[PDB]
Symmetry: D2
Subunit: 317 residues, 4 copies
């Protein structure tokens, strides 16, 4: 009935574009919560005027008070740091953000548990597969109620780069990147399709070569780094990917979207979060889809999970 209340814990660059897109889509009332005094109110105010241009009617409010999490239907956590200190852009590594963000998850998780234990949570803060589980553990939410951003975004890059080479609608390329959001992300060439057709047929037709695809894979993995090194920050597509996830939940679209979710034996892994296709609908994570990987792909998946696992103890520290 009342619109969904969507609290953006973190009102930085991603938060700002998420607020924008929520109003564009009329998805629900938005709270831009941040620890920075007044900034979220300023961003909220600005954003709120777009209801007029968008023909929407979503309240957009800023907050510097954790208890505004109360009544949240969806909580999207981008709170934290994008860069580590003393580290240059060339040395940008999501792993280095771990010391910086760990303590922030715990605190937010405690606030979510107190204020909106029944909210659907999307964790973004890097290293996301680690931060999401830490938040899961501190917020107390059901495993079907929290996920991390990764695959929707990593695959939008891969999908997009292939679509440009093949000159097809970007969305008509489908692809899977799993395990973790980071330099070990697992790009599954075998699960790439174009217009539902195995990418291998386009390779057989010399429309795109294996070499080009290897360069696209490399680019995909290094995209965040590439953007950081172009004197920009990746936040527009991250926001759009998060909103697509939040939207599938809110409107019960049941889209299959690759997100970081609690693995309970899939791919041989339990007690960790990892990226895999899930179905996001009214009941949250409605299905966790386990790709029937081959042994080579599973080996890569293990390598990705091993990285998340390695940082599990460091996060919890």
């Amino acid at each position: 009935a009342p619109k969904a209340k969507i609290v953006l814990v973190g009102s930085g660059m991603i938060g700002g574009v998420m607020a924008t897109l929520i109003v564009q889509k009329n998805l629900g009332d938005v709270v831009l919560f941040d620890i920075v005094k007044n900034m979220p109110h300023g961003k909220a105010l600005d954003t709120s005027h777009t209801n007029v241009m968008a023909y929407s009617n979503c309240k957009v409010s800023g907050s510097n008070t954790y208890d505004d999490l109360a009544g949240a239907d969806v909580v999207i956590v981008t709170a934290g740091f994008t860069k580590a200190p003393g580290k240059s852009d060339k040395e940008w590594n999501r792993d280095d953000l771990l010391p910086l963000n760990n303590k922030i998850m715990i605190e937010i998780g405690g606030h979510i548990k107190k204020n909106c234990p029944n909210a659907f949570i999307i964790v973004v803060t890097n290293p996301v597969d680690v931060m999401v589980q830490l938040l899961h553990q501190h917020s107390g939410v059901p495993k079907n109620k929290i996920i991390g951003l990764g695959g929707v975004l990593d695959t939008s890059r891969l999908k997009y780069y292939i679509s440009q080479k093949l000159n097809v609608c970007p969305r008509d390329v489908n692809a899977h990147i799993v395990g973790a959001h980071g330099n070990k992300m697992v790009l599954l060439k075998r699960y790439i399709t174009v217009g539902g057709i195995p990418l291998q047929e386009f390779i057989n037709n010399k429309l795109i070569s294996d070499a080009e695809l290897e360069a696209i894979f490399d680019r995909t993995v290094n995209t965040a780094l590439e953007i950081v090194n172009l004197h920009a920050a990746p936040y527009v597509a991250p926001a759009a990917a998060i909103i697509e996830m939040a939207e599938s939940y809110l409107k019960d679209l049941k889209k299959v979207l690759i997100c970081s979710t609690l693995l309970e034996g899939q791919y041989g892994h339990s007690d960790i979060f990892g990226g895999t296709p899930v179905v996001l609908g009214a009941n949250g994570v409605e299905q966790v889809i386990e790709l029937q990987l081959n042994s080579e792909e599973k080996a890569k998946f293990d390598e990705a999970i091993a990285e998340t696992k390695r940082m599990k103890p460091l996060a919890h520290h």
Copy 2:
């Protein structure tokens, strides 16, 4: 610059929903042309008021004059009959429409050639793979400028039925039905994916069985018949499929959409139209994608084409 002018040659049930959806999408000015006196003006008038609710600004005009094809950017041909005479609903067969519609294509084609030889044409009238080629031949338009409706619609049924069984977003099922739009349409189980994942994995996981899929295939092929026999007429999804095609053209989306197009050696066939994925963009049919079918699938494709071919001489009569 000026909006696209979209002439709907045929202002019956499909025409009406196409006009509706064009205004909803603000795709261009619409002409509802029909041979029935005044009906198209009445439908156009009604439809035109929806600009207000849709926040659009597309003119919608009725026409009983072929020369209103002048300046058309897109021409969508639904002109003809849905049912044959003396034939009951249980005996509904698209082939029987051939005697009834053949002469209508020729005439329209002559008008298109005179009035809008550079228009992009979408032929719908059944039996579509036959009628489209007849129109192609009489209108004189380039082969990259005309297609027939079939696969977008047949696959929306298959996609939809599978998505309901697997509880995923309908659009997340991708599937291919090729050769012809009719009882010989070729359903390619091998090219079905769900969230980009081979349907076989869901079958392996007992999430959907082969038997269920065979029933869904049967239903898909018989859908039009099923609808006709429920005391309804299939026209809403046909319209939406046509609009999705027209939209990809008009907005240069480059979607891969299975349509009836002139085959020039694909699948071993030339000098006939058949359903296959194509990319529809600014330049019309930008790419004709040839699925690398196996011999069994190709045999079915041949059977479908053989039917179109069989009726080629009857149409031209």
Copy 3:
């Protein structure tokens, strides 16, 4: 959480376009209920495939069982007749539909009371201002939970016709037509704006003359008749207007939309429904806005209400 369930009581022409638009907009699951055997299932089936083209995920089901009203969040009543018997198109009068539809409202109202007493109801069946109150009285729903279609549709015509003369975006003309949906509808020249600017300025600028506006008023009042007499049936804009209302409710947009609602002293009238701007949001009819009419406009409003009132006793018969 679960999508809204929208039951279309009546699955005829308006019902069909409403189902189409609901899926286009992803507004909720739809039930096409009708007394005609199987037709609604056929229409629902057809419509359901458009989820694919629309990227939506709304179930569309047919029903021939009143109890499928159970759990309805919104009920839209188009059940009834568009034309009276023996009456020609030239003699088409909404009043004549009263004998034909009265008994249908009562029955539906009883089913709504039993099955979905907390649903938001939109009554369309003509003569709507009479049928809506009859349904209100039999369904038992709160006065903030039921309205009739009229002004959104009548004004879309007026708005549209003026926008064409002035060459502005249709939605940029705002206008009010109140009292009743019928030949006594009250067109308030004084409340017409174009881009928020009094229409009188455009008249002063000779951009549109009083005479042209009087012809547009006449056309607006006679539009339904004009469409019927063009061998068409007004149902596309009616559907779009109803969906805009249903949408404002469902998404809590709080749009000001002129609908038939229970008057409780506004304009000097009580215990009757009449068309006036209301605000439709999460709580239904959130505000009933009383235009501060002058005495001349109020006299017309009285004339409109007098007609509804005259038929009140005949309906209840």
Copy 4:
């Protein structure tokens, strides 16, 4: 045919959100041009991946080369500075930006004249009513082909603030702010409507008081300042307003939108740009609407224009 090419001259905060919204809306290919090395490529890259989530197909490219203006259909100029040096946020005044941005307009104008003299131009850089005319004069474009941002944005604030007080859909408040975008902007209480109804009726009904409206007017005028002083920057609504303008042009919507345009006697003013409602369509500024202001309102309009005029000679310096 080919999509519109939209060059965003200036790829800062507003530019970034404009690129985002263009892809969301699939409006055309986008070039993010900036003088800052590589930043626009980084932003373009990020933005480009959203085609996937948006189902769009708009190229988004960065540029550090003026000649990428070639072939532009629309040019949106945000190039310049938001704050003056040594000036604190509390002292933020658009006028102070004049020395900083004047030289930038001239240069861009010369590039537009050389590269895309037939492009439709939207100038944003402050003080906009001054910068727009300077660009007009240097680019050589027809007066119907260039406008400045102001009223769509200033009025979205006023509209929004009133809609919150009255609890109606933001877009249902219409209002006019004219003359100039700055502290002398002219808020015309007399032209405010809510759901097409004179705001005075809501004031008469004590739904909003004159005092509240005066506070809302003050807030509206000071909004940019308020946002700057909340540790934020107004750029989301500016972007949305610009896109709504660009969109009306590109899709020939003919929306009435208040923009800065060349006055040729309206309001008694010639040879200057000032904010007034215009109709934006395929042919650019299709109509310049002159509000029939009273003498008090005209006096304010003169005060606003006098400010633009005062800075005319300083800009040209």
